């Protein structure tokens, strides 16, 4: 832990500076150091951890998809040698390393200490998300196990959020959006994908009347992402 000698409060302050600077690798490393201090994370600190790693893995997924596409076009075609495959493997190995880093943080020991609905559902969502990114690139004998590790984390998160959070809760809506996409493009379950997004959209719509203007904006922002997916899929 290269961050072990910095103050937790300085690690958090520098993650926010690094967001403002669009330095997401620094942001992630700062938030990694903060988590490794061993204290629970606040709501804001959880968002910083999520935002930081999502931008890092997002750059790697975009890069992976471009190289996977070139590599497929070269397997249809004039042989160019092993360079496309080797580079796509290097990026992929880096991507798997980032997903393993996040999963290790959730397993040591964020999830076992998360007693509140909002914290536990948040981390269980992250676990599903980072198993899903692994599954996007998996081809071997562990692909089925990876998919099931995503499904299992997503399901436990869904069970808690159903019992403990209103249908408009932004973490609950984000979980359902992502779980829906998992059904669609990972689990080959497009009907399940569509059913969960309609049901999520409809139940939140009925709860909107209970909300303040700011909560209303938060929730309706995510309902619009659910509706966009459904428009794309139907």
């Amino acid at each position: 832990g290269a961050m072990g000698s910095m103050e937790r409060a300085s690690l958090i302050q520098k993650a926010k500076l690094a967001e403002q600077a669009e330095r997401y690798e620094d942001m992630a490393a700062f938030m990694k150091g903060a988590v490794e201090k061993g204290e629970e994370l606040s709501c804001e600190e959880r968002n910083l951890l999520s935002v930081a790693y999502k931008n890092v893995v997002g750059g790697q997924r975009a890069a992976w998809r471009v190289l996977s596409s070139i590599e497929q076009k070269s397997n249809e075609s004039e042989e160019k040698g092993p360079e496309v495959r080797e580079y796509r493997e290097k990026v992929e190995t880096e991507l798997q390393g980032v997903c393993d880093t996040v999963l290790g943080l959730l397993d040591s020991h964020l999830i076992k200490e998360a007693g509140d609905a909002e914290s536990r559902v948040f981390y269980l969502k992250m676990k599903g998300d980072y198993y899903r990114y692994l599954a996007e690139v998996a081809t071997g004998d562990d692909k089925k196990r990876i998919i099931d590790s995503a499904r299992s984390a997503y399901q436990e998160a869904m069970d808690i959020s159903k019992k403990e959070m209103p249908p408009t809760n932004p973490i609950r809506l984000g979980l359902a959006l992502n779980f829906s996409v998992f059904h669609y493009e990972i689990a080959n379950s497009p009907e399940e994908a569509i059913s969960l997004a309609k049901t999520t959209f409809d139940e939140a719509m009925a709860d909107l009347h209970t909300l303040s203007e700011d909560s209303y904006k938060d929730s309706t922002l995510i309902m619009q992402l659910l509706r966009d997916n459904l428009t794309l899929w139907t």
Partner: peptide, 10 residues
Amino acid sequence: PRRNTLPAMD
């Protein structure tokens, strides 16, 4: 138009 997941890249 790519399907949405949260959070989104910058």
